[PDB]
Design a protein around this ligand. Structure first.
Ligand SMILES: [Li+]
Length: 188
């Protein structure tokens, strides 16, 4: 009943059981994934999180937690597809759990710039961020076919799907990501 569902991508898998859970690393007392979720909730009413470890911890802030299908597909696309299979509604705005400064015009600018394409993603002036992406429902069967073919490459898929980059180069540093606990330590 709203137009775009926001989605925090907190990562797959768990060949990572027993490793750092990056989305739960805290920045000024608040888990990174919640900084992303809170920024998406500024701009969208309905926001969910895709998480495959520590689900109970993710569930404690009261948002729906969506787990990957047993297919165990690789990479960020697998989370996107699991969310589309488990949520209704025609558009999704995905964002990884490690980019806590995303701006309040993310959804609005991606939508303004979509120009009829079924997918658009953020370019920050230096690089594409193809997991920060506004995706139409119609992508679901193409994603399923691509992952069932054993493919994983995110940019390749976005290109095959007819998407384009949207220029956010004027948003200084809104798209910086925390790659490691070492980097997080610097942003405190
Ligand atoms: Li653990």
């Amino acid at each position: 009943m709203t137009t775009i569902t926001g989605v925090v991508l907190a990562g797959g898998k768990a060949r990572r059981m027993g490793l750092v859970d990056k989305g739960l690393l805290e920045l000024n007392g608040k888990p990174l994934w919640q900084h992303v979720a809170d920024a998406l909730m500024t701009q969208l009413s309905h926001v969910v999180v895709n998480a495959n470890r520590h689900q109970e911890i993710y569930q404690a802030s009261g948002l729906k937690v969506i787990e990957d299908s047993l297919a165990d597909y690789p990479g960020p696309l697998a989370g996107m597809l699991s969310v589309m299979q488990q949520e209704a509604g025609e558009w999704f705005l995905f964002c990884p759990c490690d980019t806590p400064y995303i701006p309040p015009d993310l959804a609005a600018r991606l939508n303004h710039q979509r120009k009829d394409a079924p997918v658009v993603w953020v370019h920050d002036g230096e690089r594409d961020h193809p997991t920060i992406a506004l995706v139409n429902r119609a992508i679901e069967p193409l994603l399923l076919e691509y992952l069932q073919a054993g493919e994983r490459r995110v940019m390749v898929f976005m290109r095959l799907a007819g998407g384009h980059a949207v220029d956010f180069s004027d948003h200084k540093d809104a798209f910086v990501n925390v790659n490691t606990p070492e980097e997080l330590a610097r942003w405190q």
